[PDB]
Ligand SMILES: O=P(O)(O)OC[C@H]1C[C@H](OP(=O)(O)OP(=O)(O)O)[C@H](O)[C@@H]1O
Ligand SMILES: O=P(O)(O)OC[C@H]1C[C@H](OP(=O)(O)OP(=O)(O)O)[C@H](O)[C@@H]1O
Ligand SMILES: [Zn+2]
Ligand SMILES: [Zn+2]
Ligand SMILES: [Zn+2]
């Protein structure tokens with residue numbers, strides 16, 4: 001980032017949530033400890049389904065939750081598209097609508113298209 | 114006692130045909146007494162062959178099943194074009210009460226919807242020309258009617274099944290068997306006997322291909338009953354169908370050359386969409402069997418999406434009580450019931466709700482349309498929405 | 503009057519469910535009085551997906567249908583492995599008498615045979631491990647039993663359907679629904695209630711995947727009832743099945759690591775041969791639905807191959823009265839009845855006739871084996887003949 005003159009951005013590791021021992025407690029600690037200028041994207045999928053952990057992250061920090069990250073493991077990606085939609089729904093239904101969908105995890109052109 | 118492994122109307126209405134683990138579910142709930150109100154959804158995450166749309170069928174029988182049971186049943190009008198993830202029917206009440214009716218209700222919507230969708234697609238592929246259901250011979254007679262009634266609602270002009278025809282209020286149509294011509298021992302003598310013995314209101318289609326080539330027997334049937342010969346039927350056996358299209362043309366020619374021009378070409382015999390598409394423009398009417406009767410069911414599933422006004426559903430299932438709004442341009446939209454549409458998100462148009470109450474506390478608050486008018490509904494949607502095969 | 507579009511046992515035995523053109527055939531023949539003795543054959547020119555063999559099913563119901571009718575009915579023992587062009591059942595008499603029973607008899611042999619063959623193939627693909635029929639939810643309840651009875655004869659160890667289980671003389675097995683766990687509101691609380699409320703003779707398989715990952719809920723179910731947990735069920739939704747194999751292993755691991763080693767892996771959920779083949783060696787028992795219940799019928803057809811001792815059949819159909827000889831090495835041989843085999847054309851062995859009399863002039867000259875013993879017959883053939891999927 002530096003050598004270019006840019007700020008290296010990022011989100012949350014699985015390690016953080018696992019060592020802290022609790023999803024909610026984890027992204028709570030992140031919300032408080034890290035600077036405010038740092039968008040807060042919650043690393044959903046860890047123990048519970050993305051659908052479940054997504055709303056949890058919403059009903060916590062609520063408007064502090066800039067986005068939710070989906071990185072479903074390959075053994076679990078039956079239909080990423082569908083999975084992504086289901087999250088958007090469970091969020092939309094429960095009135096959470098500002099939270100965006102951020103994804104990462106082994107993807108190329110065809111997968112992104 | 115019972116000579117056929119079928120279920121009696123009572124045993125089904127009873128719930129004797131369900132999966133045991135549902136009975137055991139009523140036990141746990143009843144004993145440990147866990148009574149509570151839930152809203153269950155009926156949808157599919159896919160349609161056979163990954164088709165884009167399907168034809169809803171069976172809403173009737175389902176009402177006649179949950180009839181007189183502690184629940185509410187909202188639904189889409191039978192024959193409605195639907196899609197994956199869109200609830201085609203909902204149920205509200207104590208799971209402990211209706212949960213023992215999944216095995217039956219889903220089966221009722223599933224196979225019917227399957228056959229219908231199949232049918233409508235064939236209709237479309239046949240450029241809406243006439244198509245007659247002939248497939249009940251490939252399935253158990255017990256369901257002979259549900260099938261023909263589905264092929265019908267699906268777009269089939271007529272039905273082969275007798276008992277099935279009636280229950281709908283239709284005349285079962287048909288043609289000539291190979292047995293007739295073979296026992297009678299002579300092609301000509303056979304369709305002559307048919308011309309005289311059978312009523313006059315019955316179109317007379319000659320079963321050509323039997324011993325001689327279709328080309329030969331076609332003219333014979335023409336130079337006999339001549340103007341009494343409404344059509345000729347071609348059902349070339351697979352071992353003989355080198356190029357059905359070509360064979361169909363050759364018949365038309367040999368007939369046209371010899372001045373016979375009123376006789377139409379009616380075909381039947383193991384054919385689906387792709388097969389019909391390559392032969393529509395040269396055939397007058399289609400006889401379809403298995404592709405419609407043996408069509409694949411729609412993987413319909415019943416899943417609780419809300420418990421006590423609380424939005425909750427398992428993995429891969431949508432949560433909450435919802436409605437599906439359809440505009441006159443076929444654009445659908447599934448949204449939460451907590452909101453209400455009026456404008457069509459896409460091409461601004463008036464949109465109307467599809468989930469409507471059909472059973473209020475075990476009471477069927479609706480009059481169910483007769484088959485033919487539902488079928489009227491399917492074909493209108495097909496054309497209005499410009500459905501594509 | 504009737505609340506479901508099904509046919510009553512009487513209407514079927516009557517012949518009210520046939521294709522009109524068969525009635526009209528009786529008219530022509532009866533009126534113009536063309537009575538004569540004929541021998542009709544029942545075969546297929548192909549099996550679904552161009553499979554090599556199929557499992558014969560329905561010989562029973564057919565006898566109970568032609569019962570009390572002016573004809574003879576020879577057949578192969580229900581459950582027999584058969585092939586294309588080999589008559590699985592014959593009928594002798596005045597076509598005018600039984601001809602109105604094609605629509606019913608063919609459907610009876612066709613769909614059953616279809617489901618059975620499907621089942622047996624699944625059995626084989628699963629390395630004969632246990633497989634339980636769960637598919638009746640995708641078809642009409644009216645036929646719920648015929649199906650489960652077919653999945654059974656096919657090789658399925660157990661059946662989900664209650665009414666279907668009984669009529670055979672079997673106990674309908676099952677596990678846990680998603681509804682149970684969701685209404686109860688808690689995974690653990692749910693399978694706890696099940697462990698206490700349900701009988702002890704009922705194996706206890708925990709329905710894992712619901713809200714949490716299978717990996718998480720698997721151990722939970724273990725650290726609860728511990729040695730009461732006979733098995734864990736995996737039915738990952740399609741949107742979640744990235745690599746079922748891998749998912750199945752991960753569960754086995756997380757269980758093995760935490761010292762739980764008696765708990766087996768039971769899976770179910772949209773699976774066929776290819777899917778099972780890629781997961782057999784890591785699963786204990788299979789739960790199969792649609793691939794067996796919604797299996798495709800066997801294109802069975804009834805064709806007169808002889809009229810008045812005279813050999814005659816239409817195009818693409820074999821002519822004459824014949825028999826099929828089978829040796830103990832599965833080598834089949836269809837030959838004319840005018841001749842008799844004793845030696846097996848191939849590996850010289852003793853061969854025995856398959857077409858045997860079952861109905862003498864409307865009189866059922868046979869006692870029909872109970873389901874389970876027929877099934878005994880299928881699996882024995884599968885192994886003896888070394889059937890390949
Ligand atoms: O598309 P399919 O599923 O094959 O079925 C469609 C037709 C053809 C077949 O009869 P044919 O073999 O054409 O003649 P017949 O009635 O004389 O036996 C069957 O009885 C239906 O009438
Ligand atoms: O192979 P298929 O035709 O898909 O069906 C096989 C299984 C799975 C499905 O239930 P699940 O979706 O696994 O779970 P649940 O019974 O709780 O609805 C169905 O009720 C049968 O038990
Ligand atoms: Zn992850
Ligand atoms: Zn023919
Ligand atoms: Zn619109």
Ligand SMILES: [Zn+2]
Pocket residue numbers: 680710711712737738739
């Ligand atoms: Zn599941």
Ligand SMILES: [Zn+2]
Pocket residue numbers: 829830831832833846848849850851
């Ligand atoms: Zn041999």
